[PDB]
Amino acid sequence: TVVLLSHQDTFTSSDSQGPTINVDKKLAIAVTIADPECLSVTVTQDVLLNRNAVINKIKVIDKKRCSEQGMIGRNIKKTSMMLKVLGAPGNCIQRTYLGGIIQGFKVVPIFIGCPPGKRLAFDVSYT
Amino acid sequence: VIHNKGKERTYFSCSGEGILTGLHTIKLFLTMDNLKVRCFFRNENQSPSKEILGLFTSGGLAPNMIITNSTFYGGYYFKLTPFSNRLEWL
Amino acid sequence: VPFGIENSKDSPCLLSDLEITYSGKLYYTIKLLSKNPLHELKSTDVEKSVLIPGYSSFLIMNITDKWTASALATMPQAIKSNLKFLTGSWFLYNFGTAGGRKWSISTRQCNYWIQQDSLDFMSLNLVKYIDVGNTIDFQFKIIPKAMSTFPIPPVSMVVGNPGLVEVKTQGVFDLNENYYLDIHVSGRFFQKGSTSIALVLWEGSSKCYAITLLPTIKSSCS
Amino acid sequence: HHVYYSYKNFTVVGTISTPSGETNLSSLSQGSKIHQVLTDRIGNVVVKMENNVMFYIKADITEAVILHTWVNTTAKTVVLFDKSFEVCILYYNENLDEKYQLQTQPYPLILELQSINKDLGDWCPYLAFQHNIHSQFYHMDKGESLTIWSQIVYPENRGLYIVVEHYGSSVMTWTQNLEYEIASGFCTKTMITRFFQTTNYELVDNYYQLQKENTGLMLLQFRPSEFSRTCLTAKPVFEIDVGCDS
Amino acid sequence: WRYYINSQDYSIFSTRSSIKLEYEGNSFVSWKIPESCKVENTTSPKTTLHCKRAGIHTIKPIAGNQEVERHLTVDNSYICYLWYFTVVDVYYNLSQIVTIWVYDPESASTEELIWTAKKPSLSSRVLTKQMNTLGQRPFIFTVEKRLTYHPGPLTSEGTWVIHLPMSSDDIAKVIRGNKVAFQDCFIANLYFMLTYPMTIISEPPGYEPLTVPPGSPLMLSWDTCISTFALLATDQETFQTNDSFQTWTRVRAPPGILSDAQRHSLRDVIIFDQGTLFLVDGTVYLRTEDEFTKLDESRGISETGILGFSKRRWCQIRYLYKLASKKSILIAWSKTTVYAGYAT
Amino acid sequence: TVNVQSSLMDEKLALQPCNVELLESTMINTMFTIDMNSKLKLSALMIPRKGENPTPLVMVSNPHALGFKANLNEFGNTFDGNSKYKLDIELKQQHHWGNSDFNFTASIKRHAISSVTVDIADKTLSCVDLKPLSTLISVGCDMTKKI
Amino acid sequence: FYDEKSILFSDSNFQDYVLLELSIDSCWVGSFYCPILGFSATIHDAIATESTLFIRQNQLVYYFTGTYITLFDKSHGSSRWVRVLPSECIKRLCPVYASGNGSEYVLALTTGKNEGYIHIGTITDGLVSFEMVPDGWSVCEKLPGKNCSIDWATYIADERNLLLLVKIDSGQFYLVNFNTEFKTLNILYKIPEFIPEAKELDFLVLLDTVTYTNTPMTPKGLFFNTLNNMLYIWGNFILQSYNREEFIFLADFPKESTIKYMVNSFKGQMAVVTENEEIWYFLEGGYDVYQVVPSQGWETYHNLQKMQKSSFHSEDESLVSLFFEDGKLFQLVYLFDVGKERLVKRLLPVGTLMEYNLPKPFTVVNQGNYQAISFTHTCPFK
Numbered sequence A: 001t002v003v004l005l006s007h008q009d010t011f012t013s014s015d016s017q018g019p020t021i022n023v024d025k026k027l028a029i030a031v032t033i034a035d036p037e038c039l040s041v042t043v044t045q046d047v048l049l050n051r052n053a054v055i056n057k058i059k060v061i062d063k064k065r066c067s068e069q070g071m072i073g074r075n076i077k078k079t080s081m082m083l084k085v086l087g088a089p090g091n092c093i094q095r096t097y098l099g100g101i102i103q104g105f106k107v108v109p110i111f112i113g114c115p116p117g118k119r120l121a122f123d124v125s126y127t
Numbered sequence B: 001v002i003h004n005k006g007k008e009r010t011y012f013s014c015s016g017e018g019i020l021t022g023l024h025t026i027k028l029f030l031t032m033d034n035l036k037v038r039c040f041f042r043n044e045n046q047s048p049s050k051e052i053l054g055l056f057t058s059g060g061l062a063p064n065m066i067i068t069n070s071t072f073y074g075g076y077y078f079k080l081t082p083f084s085n086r087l088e089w090l
Numbered sequence C: 001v002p003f004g005i006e007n008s009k010d011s012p013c014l015l016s017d018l019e020i021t022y023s024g025k026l027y028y029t030i031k032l033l034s035k036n037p038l039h040e041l042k043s044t045d046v047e048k049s050v051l052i053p054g055y056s057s058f059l060i061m062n063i064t065d066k067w068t069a070s071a072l073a074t075m076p077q078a079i080k081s082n083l084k085f086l087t088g089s090w091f092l093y094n095f096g097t098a099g100g101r102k103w104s105i106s107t108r109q110c111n112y113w114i115q116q117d118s119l120d121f122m123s124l125n126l127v128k129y130i131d132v133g134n135t136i137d138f139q140f141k142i143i144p145k146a147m148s149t150f151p152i153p154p155v156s157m158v159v160g161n162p163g164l165v166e167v168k169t170q171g172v173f174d175l176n177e178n179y180y181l182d183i184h185v186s187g188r189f190f191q192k193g194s195t196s197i198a199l200v201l202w203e204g205s206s207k208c209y210a211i212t213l214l215p216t217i218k219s220s221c222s
Numbered sequence D: 001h002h003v004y005y006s007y008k009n010f011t012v013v014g015t016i017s018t019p020s021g022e023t024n025l026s027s028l029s030q031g032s033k034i035h036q037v038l039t040d041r042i043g044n045v046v047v048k049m050e051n052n053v054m055f056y057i058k059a060d061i062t063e064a065v066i067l068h069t070w071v072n073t074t075a076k077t078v079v080l081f082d083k084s085f086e087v088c089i090l091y092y093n094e095n096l097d098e099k100y101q102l103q104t105q106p107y108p109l110i111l112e113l114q115s116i117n118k119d120l121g122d123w124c125p126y127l128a129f130q131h132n133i134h135s136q137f138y139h140m141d142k143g144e145s146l147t148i149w150s151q152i153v154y155p156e157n158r159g160l161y162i163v164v165e166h167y168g169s170s171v172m173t174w175t176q177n178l179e180y181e182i183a184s185g186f187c188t189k190t191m192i193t194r195f196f197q198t199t200n201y202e203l204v205d206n207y208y209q210l211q212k213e214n215t216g217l218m219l220l221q222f223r224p225s226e227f228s229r230t231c232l233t234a235k236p237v238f239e240i241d242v243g244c245d246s
Numbered sequence E: 001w002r003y004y005i006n007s008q009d010y011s012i013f014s015t016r017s018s019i020k021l022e023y024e025g026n027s028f029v030s031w032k033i034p035e036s037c038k039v040e041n042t043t044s045p046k047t048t049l050h051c052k053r054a055g056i057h058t059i060k061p062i063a064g065n066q067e068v069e070r071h072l073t074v075d076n077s078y079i080c081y082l083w084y085f086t087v088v089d090v091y092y093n094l095s096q097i098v099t100i101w102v103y104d105p106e107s108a109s110t111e112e113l114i115w116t117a118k119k120p121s122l123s124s125r126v127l128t129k130q131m132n133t134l135g136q137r138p139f140i141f142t143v144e145k146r147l148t149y150h151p152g153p154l155t156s157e158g159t160w161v162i163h164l165p166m167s168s169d170d171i172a173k174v175i176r177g178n179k180v181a182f183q184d185c186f187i188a189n190l191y192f193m194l195t196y197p198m199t200i201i202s203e204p205p206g207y208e209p210l211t212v213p214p215g216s217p218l219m220l221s222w223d224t225c226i227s228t229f230a231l232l233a234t235d236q237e238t239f240q241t242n243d244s245f246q247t248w249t250r251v252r253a254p255p256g257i258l259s260d261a262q263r264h265s266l267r268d269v270i271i272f273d274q275g276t277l278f279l280v281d282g283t284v285y286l287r288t289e290d291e292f293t294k295l296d297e298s299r300g301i302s303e304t305g306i307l308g309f310s311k312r313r314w315c316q317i318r319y320l321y322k323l324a325s326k327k328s329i330l331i332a333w334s335k336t337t338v339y340a341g342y343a344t
Numbered sequence F: 001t002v003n004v005q006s007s008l009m010d011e012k013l014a015l016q017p018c019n020v021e022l023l024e025s026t027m028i029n030t031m032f033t034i035d036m037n038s039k040l041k042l043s044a045l046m047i048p049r050k051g052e053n054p055t056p057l058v059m060v061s062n063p064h065a066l067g068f069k070a071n072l073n074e075f076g077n078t079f080d081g082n083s084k085y086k087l088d089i090e091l092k093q094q095h096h097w098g099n100s101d102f103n104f105t106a107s108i109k110r111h112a113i114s115s116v117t118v119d120i121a122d123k124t125l126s127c128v129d130l131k132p133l134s135t136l137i138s139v140g141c142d143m144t145k146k147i
Numbered sequence G: 001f002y003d004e005k006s007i008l009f010s011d012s013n014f015q016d017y018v019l020l021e022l023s024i025d026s027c028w029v030g031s032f033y034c035p036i037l038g039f040s041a042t043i044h045d046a047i048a049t050e051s052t053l054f055i056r057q058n059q060l061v062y063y064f065t066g067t068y069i070t071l072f073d074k075s076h077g078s079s080r081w082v083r084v085l086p087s088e089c090i091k092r093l094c095p096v097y098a099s100g101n102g103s104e105y106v107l108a109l110t111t112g113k114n115e116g117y118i119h120i121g122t123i124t125d126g127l128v129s130f131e132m133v134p135d136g137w138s139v140c141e142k143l144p145g146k147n148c149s150i151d152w153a154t155y156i157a158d159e160r161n162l163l164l165l166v167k168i169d170s171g172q173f174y175l176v177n178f179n180t181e182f183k184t185l186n187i188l189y190k191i192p193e194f195i196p197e198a199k200e201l202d203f204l205v206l207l208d209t210v211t212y213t214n215t216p217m218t219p220k221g222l223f224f225n226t227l228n229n230m231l232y233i234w235g236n237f238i239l240q241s242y243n244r245e246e247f248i249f250l251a252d253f254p255k256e257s258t259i260k261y262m263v264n265s266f267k268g269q270m271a272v273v274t275e276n277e278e279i280w281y282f283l284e285g286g287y288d289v290y291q292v293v294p295s296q297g298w299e300t301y302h303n304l305q306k307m308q309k310s311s312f313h314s315e316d317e318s319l320v321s322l323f324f325e326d327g328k329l330f331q332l333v334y335l336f337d338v339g340k341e342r343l344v345k346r347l348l349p350v351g352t353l354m355e356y357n358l359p360k361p362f363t364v365v366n367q368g369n370y371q372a373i374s375f376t377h378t379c380p381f382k
């Protein structure tokens, strides 16, 4: 879930035409999928104009595709997905004590396969 | 409890009769006898008023005394009484 | 706040162009391009700073001509060339002592709030007793009424005789930059003594009602 | 020669007046007669004289707006909607190539109106009006109810609210619950309206007659308290019919 | 003077859009534009304008005669591209197949802009396959009944192929996509209406024209639910079209049915899917691909008194289809009597 | 039709903005019954203005018959940074609290009525749509009771 | 290192380093078939893979594998530098930054002899084995022209795909793909001569028909990121591609500058070093390259480090190199301080540099009868 706090006068009266304000004209949240055949990314939008807040919930789902029956690290496929705000990278800096941080931009790597730490054991007590 | 929230005004005037200090602050003293104090809500009228007492009593509100120390916390409630005669809380 | 720039009425020099040339010694000579006379520079403007955002700032101090002046420079390494500014590109500020001193230094307003919702922990001075194997846990919240030093925690804490008390501290920031810290205090072994753990808002100014908190931990019979 | 209006269930009836006040649209068109009037779902109305000068009207607004000249006074044109609801102008002329006789060109009505507004200086009293009425037809049986969520955001003390208007058979009941909030120099007034039936049919006599009395169709619209031109919001109108799907 | 934009959708309108300025007049001098906008060939009456900075820009043609100045509002947007679909309907399977691709109005071909195109251009093909490989897929959503239809994989030529039924109950559809932006630009959702195709009347040779009286303004009548199926009656000929007058067909009457002045004296025209109705000198005639009877007292209409007639203006297709008992689709009047015309 | 909220913006009048951002509860919808030796809990949510500090108070129409204990506690803050305060009111019969005098309680055999109101003590004008919360409470028979 | 067979060997991440003279015999293996070039003792194309490290000296390739008990047996470790590929002349040694399939790889590009072929060397459990992947036939056979030369290559551990850019006798460059699992190569792209021209374009999708400026386009190398399947071709330019089919020309990098090398974060950021020793920064979200090091913000940050009296910053310094550590750009630099000259790894906070870039759109707002300079915000969100 990404919360976008907009400026004081980002949205005007012209943005409301239909049942919902056209937020994507001013403030757009975008997702990019590498290898979209076995990943589904769904974005859900909510807007609070009084609080100047945009709540975006991004759900990433595996498509029961890619990889196969393997032993932990042996079947793992590397991929990633991008989430960004259009026009933000390069322009947006989060200024903190000890420096600035690039914002409006993130790449998350995803490994699809048998995760480490799954083990099957023979239960002698119950047996 | 917000410590640096800011307190720019005082609202009550309490007195022990037995002793006191500029009513700006409220300091009390214990002796052998019981600690009995008369207190009144202070608004733009510095004198005791029988309307403010009536309002707070008709809402069912009465003052509380909170006695604190390094290792102590105690609370004493002023008993609800009709404001027909009482000019201030006791 | 942005700060206020010089007005056109006060100084008409801004209604012209600007040329900076490093002079032979260390004075970057200011030159007004427009030869028009309803401009020029009054002598009121000396002990004033010409600046261009993204470049050095020059303190114009010596008036040698109806259209030029002598100034020093802050960060002179950055120049290295003639520089031409156009009208509203360059601005003038007045921080000199001549005609009064506008700038002043003072203390700031309380910028912090300390929240302790637990009863009997609210009082500023408090003494806690620990028996053998017993533990005292408490939590504080700090709300910054302003920017905050986010990478580092806003509270610094010290212990008096750490030899008889072991302290475990956990700190968490949140979305709004509020800072939550939990302190867990335990005794080391069977001995008595007292120690004072002080929690200080190092960033907070001297104007807040409560900056430091001084709990006292006693290993003894309560 | 004139345009007349009736608004809000015939409670506001009158004649459309130009901002100058001359109220006679033929006078502003150099003797031209009104040739065509177009109305769409958004609520904006285009009046085209046979001289090809156009006037703009807005639903529930009693003032017309003359638009800048766009068409040659001698061209033979009509105005029509294209695939989408935008307006286009069709030109017809004899002595063309039999393939170029009918030429359609778009007309940017919203931008022309925006230019006229920037000249005039009107504004919209609210910035956002939101709802969840995504469909125009609502059918339901006895046990079913529907909830309409709407919201309006306006400046801090500009007293505005949402008006719900019904027309037809009042077989249904309403429950309205609103939440009012103030923040950052704006006021948000959320509203939830639930429509349901409260009639019980068990062990009652006259089942079919009562069922007939609780069967019908009604029309509903939600709109802001006050609005003007410069407000692009499309007023939602829908139907609720109680009765079986068949 | 006036101006033109490549895209009819004005959500797309932004700073990157080009505005085609046209001036018609006897004398012209130049174009006066702000510093925020660049015009090409400022001396030519017909030119192009690019306003790279957002705001309200005042444009005026300097000319000998007085000219008005327009304030164009240009706002930067992250909505830049559009959907394009080509539909082919099969009656045997009672369905219809729509091929979809992304196109950019600033760089699309002319036949794409006027929707004549049936294949993606080179630029549109490159854009479509790029937008695919970033992960963007269009889905068609029916507004009246919440039904979603998903495409197949991208075709060798960049297109997504979708199958729909010819429902005739839900005609309003929206083609949508995921939140994938190519180079900081989205694709705008497209609202359309498609249904059973409507066939226009053809013109057999040797037929006679039908016209409005000379000097009378030409009249128009379009279908209530699906526009672009319209009928234009002019002073010279009567035209009918399935699309928004890109292609038209003359509507003409058989010889000997009615007089020459009677042909030139039609006063009102209405269009339906099954046939068209002409009001000629107070009587009413039905034109169909089959036959051209006049409606008379046998059918329930008066003769030589009919002032006019009208149809429904708003598309209430859902309720009327579900109504289970057909009602009137026409109303005519004669200054004394109101006639409620049903189908047939 | 005078719209007082809009009229309370004339520059000549020069009013001050409302100091509370939100004050809401579901208690306003229904009336409540307190039977003998019974109590109930009421809840409200209030959000103040960014800078102002409003003081909420809870009042009862009949203090002789109804006694309340109210607790105001902060629980998280909104996106703008405004703290949200939860107000919990425990309501029961007056004689059971014990702070009342013998003449104040006035017996317990009789039934009575009251109305509890959550309000802002220092609310300004221009607080038109931010009305106080009110609810009617009957200290009397419970109808669903049956033997 | 200029003329010595010395390397910088560092454990940790250049937090500390030792300078070593390698134990190589520095023998001369020049032959009639092998192209003759001046003997220089320097070490080039140093590669350090897990448990093994390769070097190139004057077209000779050596490797040394360390004894890691926790990784494999001690018998695998090597006692002295072992030269690999004796007969061939290797002009360049190319890295593979990913390990696919529990193995490491290194590419060797040959010149003069067997110019059509390339060597791929697999390092598994400290054992190194090389092979010429084109097998029977060379890539020049399938390309137009009399002969060809493979001027750079990358290997994709997944997909078993080998991307290599090939120069033809005519002078044109082709980006070719060879699938190692099969034995089939197909021409992916044909690099255009001359730099495409873009007036008001920030980026340009290289469609078949575009105008061309008259400055020749010289490609130096290419890099492939497998997390997002993104391909970069760099040189006098930068070309970016998502599906190796259509490429996008980034019009912010000037055609006057040439890129020496490219450094990636594998987390969305990339750095570019040119011959002029100026660093450019690229964020994979945007189509923009920013000049970070020669810039106003860097001058501000350097002056601040002077005021704070930082021990890592000096008036005169020389960039040794730069690299990404857990998403942070660390550059190791030699300070020429008088008396206390020293090589040290410093940090380049690019966020701080961007925050201090100072010419920015601003406007003169009005306050209380006074006007002040308010900078115009550019970030779409607060």
Ligand SMILES: *[C@@H]1O[C@H](CO)[C@@H](O[C@@H]2O[C@H](CO)[C@@H](O[C@@H]3O[C@H](CO[C@@H]4O[C@H](CO)[C@@H](O)[C@H](O)[C@@H]4O)[C@@H](O)[C@H](O[C@@H]4O[C@H](CO)[C@@H](O)[C@H](O)[C@@H]4O)[C@@H]3O)[C@H](O)[C@H]2NC(C)=O)[C@H](O)[C@H]1NC(C)=O
Pocket (backbone or CB within 6 Å): D009, D010, D165, D166, D167
């Ligand atoms: C839109 O606007 C229209 C009108 O502008 C409104 O329609 C109006 O609705 C009214 C009722 O809702 C109609 O008024 C009448 O109301 C009577 C009920 O009121 C009682 O009347 C008796 C008479 O004996 C009195 O003693 C009582 O004290 C009550 O006042 C109805 O009985 C009446 O129905 C018939 O009226 C005819 C008129 O002659 C009688 O002859 C007959 O015996 C019977 O009483 C009628 O309903 C009013 O006529 C009607 N106007 C029109 C033009 O239809 C809509 O309600 C508005 N809609 C909205 C959404 O605002």
Ligand SMILES: *[C@@H]1O[C@H](CO)[C@@H](O[C@@H]2O[C@H](CO)[C@@H](O[C@@H]3O[C@H](CO)[C@@H](O)[C@H](O)[C@@H]3O)[C@H](O)[C@H]2NC(C)=O)[C@H](O)[C@H]1NC(C)=O
Pocket (backbone or CB within 6 Å): E090, E092, E093, E095, E097, E163
């Ligand atoms: C309704 O009927 C029409 C025509 O009778 C069907 O059109 C044909 O449908 C197939 C289904 O995919 C189309 O795709 C073909 O699929 C095969 C593999 O299944 C593939 O090898 C072909 O190359 C092709 O892709 C086929 O192209 C299409 N025909 C035309 C002329 O477009 C339609 O699918 C039916 N739909 C339903 C919902 O019944």
Ligand SMILES: *[C@@H]1O[C@H](CO)[C@@H](O[C@@H]2O[C@H](CO)[C@@H](O)[C@H](O)[C@H]2NC(C)=O)[C@H](O)[C@H]1NC(C)=O
Pocket (backbone or CB within 6 Å): G101, G102, G103
């Ligand atoms: C990927 O690496 C594995 C080893 O980790 C290779 O598997 C070996 O391949 C050789 C050559 O065919 C055989 O002699 C061994 O018996 C294999 N060992 C195992 C455990 O399978 C594998 O070949 C490599 N990838 C592919 C597809 O060849």
Ligand SMILES: *[C@@H]1O[C@H](CO)[C@@H](O)[C@H](O)[C@H]1NC(C)=O
Pocket (backbone or CB within 6 Å): C062, C063, C064
């Ligand atoms: C500079 O100022 C000094 C006094 O501070 C003055 O004597 C001198 O004349 C000035 N310079 C010139 C060039 O006039």
Ligand SMILES: *[C@@H]1O[C@H](CO)[C@@H](O)[C@H](O)[C@H]1NC(C)=O
Pocket (backbone or CB within 6 Å): B081, B082, B084, B085, F101, F102, F103
């Ligand atoms: C009870 O109320 C009466 C009425 O004023 C008062 O005089 C009396 O003091 C009260 N008694 C007690 C015990 O509080």
